[PDB]
Design a protein around this ligand. Structure first.
Ligand SMILES: [Zn+2]
Ligand SMILES: [Zn+2]
Ligand SMILES: [Zn+2]
Ligand SMILES: [Zn+2]
Ligand SMILES: [Zn+2]
Ligand SMILES: [Zn+2]
Lengths: 96, 96
């Protein structure tokens, strides 16, 4: 039982983004696509196409590591964070 | 003071991979490049070129999040882990 944080309903069919391979509620993925959005809602990579996938057909990587990408200005680092990390889950910190 | 885990010496000049933006000991990055390696040693993305960067000129993203990429077989997930995660730092786990 996984609830979609966009529509609020339990997900039974997923949309798998190609080629970044992130998954989301299928109906919301399509809706998003219909609207002209061509970026992955979670990582912002370009999306070539969306695959339909039933709940039990997927093997998800759950490895948690630091990003470690580097930027030449604090401004560019902030833009990277806004672009890449804001919908990619709660950041893990000692403050927990 | 950051020691290189390849050569073992303290790093004063970094090589910044373009476009994945990971950084490594400059001398080892070049050496690796001289050998014909065109993949980032940390994330395995293709590397277009290597930028030379002094220690204090970089702003690193330290956000720690889960990967969450999905695969259609356990075998493909394992290949992804071997390809993407083995030199990307200690995975964060409760087992700590
Ligand atoms: Zn939804
Ligand atoms: Zn993505
Ligand atoms: Zn992964
Ligand atoms: Zn080195
Ligand atoms: Zn890299
Ligand atoms: Zn980052």
């Amino acid at each position: 039982v996984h609830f979609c944080d966009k529509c609020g309903l339990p997900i039974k069919v997923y949309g798998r983004m190609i080629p970044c391979k992130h998954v989301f509620c299928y109906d919301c993925a399509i809706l998003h696509e219909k609207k002209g959005d061509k970026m992955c809602p979670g990582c912002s990579d370009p999306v070539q196409r969306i695959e339909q996938c039933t709940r039990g057909s997927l093997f998800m990587c759950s490895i948690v590591q630091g990003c470690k990408r580097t930027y030449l200005s604090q401004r560019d680092l902030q833009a990277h964070i806004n672009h890449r990390h804001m919908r990619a889950g709660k950041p893990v910190t000692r403050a927990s």
